[model samples]
Target: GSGEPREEAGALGPAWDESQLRSYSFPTRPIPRLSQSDPRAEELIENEEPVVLTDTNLVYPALKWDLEYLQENIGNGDFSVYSASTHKFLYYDEKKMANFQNFKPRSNREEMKFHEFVEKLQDIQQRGGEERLYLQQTLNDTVGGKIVMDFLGFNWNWINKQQGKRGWGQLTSNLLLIGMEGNVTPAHYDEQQNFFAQIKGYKRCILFPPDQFECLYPYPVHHPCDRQSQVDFDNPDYERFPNFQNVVGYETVVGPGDVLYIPMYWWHHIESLLNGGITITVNFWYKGAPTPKRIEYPLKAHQKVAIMRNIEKMLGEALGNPQEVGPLLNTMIKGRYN
Candidate 1:
């Protein structure tokens, strides 16, 4: 009652509809959704299953963050923001430039103070320019006191307990993502376990389990596109990636106060809803825990994926030239494996 206006507790339903999800033609199934207090949420998390947890206290402090508040309070820290001519801000690894000869860069990373970046954001919002910006930065000591206070105010006990109970190795870094309406982080898999908390606006996430490694066709480990799917979901090159034809993904739209569990070897493609205004997210990453059991007879898919990763890295280093990897692999398995 009074002027408090119910406190706007949490989102009641999906802020976005299916109409905002036409960026690709890939097939998607619905992901399991669980309320915050649901005991099944922990079950799914323990099972390493991808699920959207609603109304969590995970990033409650970040729920009120907006461009205006951020511009004024996010400090003078120099941040690297990516500007792209198009909506998709696919990540490109610069360290692999020497061996990554076949990849095309889609975005330019610029270093600017947080305020100027907000100015750029405002300019883009008002003038509607071709270059779109995606600001993804780690929360560090350089952030303003208020921002750090808000971060500290986050329900760390809940998350810290989950991390510990899940056999988590160590806390990596948390990334603060600020993106325009249509910005897309193309399909990729991270080696870290992720607790992706959405603070403002809605984001649609499409995910595939680690077993889909064959269908996703990740680029060579030594290349820039490492861990990134080579097959473009918008228009799949069937000739190059025929397995993608049968690939199926699980989709969910995470809204305010939602935490999406992205398991360590699972592939995820995230995008801000088409008409949903600026989306804000803070993701907690933990180092992948070692398999805590003795060897099982039939290996798990994720274990196979990790084993393959080691194999690929060894092959890349021994082969010297990245280009030679394909020829050697083809020579070894062209007719023999088939």
Candidate 2:
């Protein structure tokens, strides 16, 4: 079963039959490269590229156990359901899921499977100390855990070595199971580079490279979620978000066992199937390779970016109103980093 090709593949939606899941607009070719020794691996490294590697342990072996393992081990505090909302940030606090009972099983959106896994996480959240404590335990007990480390090309000595100041790097692996059919991870990016390995269902990922600074429309520095882009993929108001129309980026449907590499600072909007099965994914975010020397540029934009963040933090402290910080920053920087 692990080796079997997906029953549903392309452009998945509700009402799509299992036999017809693979049909989509993008060409589906066999995963181009399986081994790191292959030249393609270098292509990804040199170009900082994105590619789908099939039949690699990235998918089959690790994901083979993910769904069932999660099903059996998920708990209320450690693991709960989530849906996309433009109004507020979700999962800001791991312990504040009061509506846990409403989370559905995510199969077709007709039946809510909330509370099914609440007890599975009892041992860890209640006594295991940190969420990672039980998560590491789960990974150690599950086959998918070993596969995740191997898939990320992790080296123990390198990971343990000290950086200039950050100290020894440890991989932070976070798992999320989206149970709502239209659940989304709002348009954003992460600090570390990521291999967002899709294990169970199809997730549509729209990614914008870091260089597309003007096109993607990232929030002004004052906003709390500053790096996050303002473009809404579902309904783009061309007048307000005019850049959204011209900002064409790569779009791909990652199905069971597929690994989509998301480079650091690349903006992405991830959506679970509107009518697809439960979506399960485990992300491997590794600290970037340490830079040996600093490179001078016209303006250290990243540093200025950090300054803006600190300014926002300071204002937040003074005003006691987190919401007002965004408008205040708009008045200050006016979107000019330099």
Candidate 3:
């Protein structure tokens, strides 16, 4: 009985150990972890660098949310559950598959009720199964009153002020993520700014700046895994992605009450700490402003990424096939640009 009390009553302390973290094949340096009051924390945010801020009330009310509490309060809304036999749960888009060449679907993404998902998840955890479940659902108006009340009681005073101060776009949507131990979301870059808050348990996040785009080797814009990196961090193919060997990355293990600023277009790979039990997180995604002024000489990496995206889209449409898009670009620039 005395064995579990310390972790349950988490007013302070990390409540987790290094053994909880999952190892990866690539090397990573630690991301800066600063107190919320630290001046360097906001500086990193403004400079589009990933920073972990401790003691933030970003989702303070939700810190008390647990598996039982969420299953009970999530109401009858449809929960997007991703199930796979492997712990590496990279997301795939089926709708985009129709536009491209034939390829095998990698995941089973189904709709289930909150309680139903939790019941099956618990059964698998108890019965010793290889199948893992990750629920990534939007906290919209469809959620229950209790959960909404808890969300409304969030630290909006500070959140709204920061959003305005940063001149970010509209608050898109908040996702309620319940990830099983060792569950992984493969390296991907989102177009929007993300304010990721860890409510319970620990998650190790690996981030790479947009300049690493060549090293990461993202799929074509028309592919289902457009923004996701092709190199698997667990087992990278050095021959296929040679630049990956020289890639530099930053990482951090985030715990409860910690808010991570994930800048727009930055690549991030997230994993629930190994053997750390279930983890809870809520992320606020904001679209960047349409007119991003102050363009200077030597284009930023993200700005160049945007330009490359436009070029790919235009070329893909102009050629009517992504397969030839690569050869066409090579033919045009290989001997000339070099």
Collision count for each candidate, in order: 0, 7, 0
Range of the 10 consecutive residues with the lowest summed lDDT in candidate 2: 129-138
Once fitted onto the true fold, the runs of candidate 1 whose alpha carbons sit more than 4 angstroms away are: 1-14
Q: Model 2, range 193-250, lDDT digits (tens) per residue?
A: 5666677767766666665566567664444335776665556567887756566456
Q: What C-alpha lDDT do the candidate models reach, one value each?
A: 0.83, 0.49, 0.84
On the 0 to 100 scale, the lDDT of residue 151 in model 1 is 91
Across 1-338, the per-residue lDDT of candidate 3 in tens digits comes to 00111243656554666666666666778778787788898899889898988877889789899988877777787888999888888677776786665877767888988888988898998887588899988877467788888988888988887788889879998888998898988899988888899989888888999999999999888788889999988888999999998888888878888899999999998888788889999999998767547788798899889999999989888998767778898999988996
Instruction: For candidate 3, list the clashing residue pairs, or say none.
Output: none
TM-score for all predictions?
0.92, 0.59, 0.92
lDDT of 1 at 167: 82
What's the distance in Å from true for residue 216, model 1? 1.0
> Which lDDT tens digits does candidate 1 get at residues 1-338?
00111123385554456667655656677777787678898888888888888767888888999988887887788788998997777777898888866667877899888888888888988888567798889988478788988998898888888878888888988888898888888899998898999998888888999999989999888888789999878789999999998788888878788899998889998888777888999998999777667898687788898888888878888987877887898899989996
The lDDT of model 1 is 0.83
State the local distance difference test value for candidate 2: 0.49
Q: What is the overall TM-score of model 2 with all chains considered together?
A: 0.59
**lDDT order of candidates, best first?**
3, 1, 2
Using TM-score as the yardstick, the better of models 1 and 2 is 1
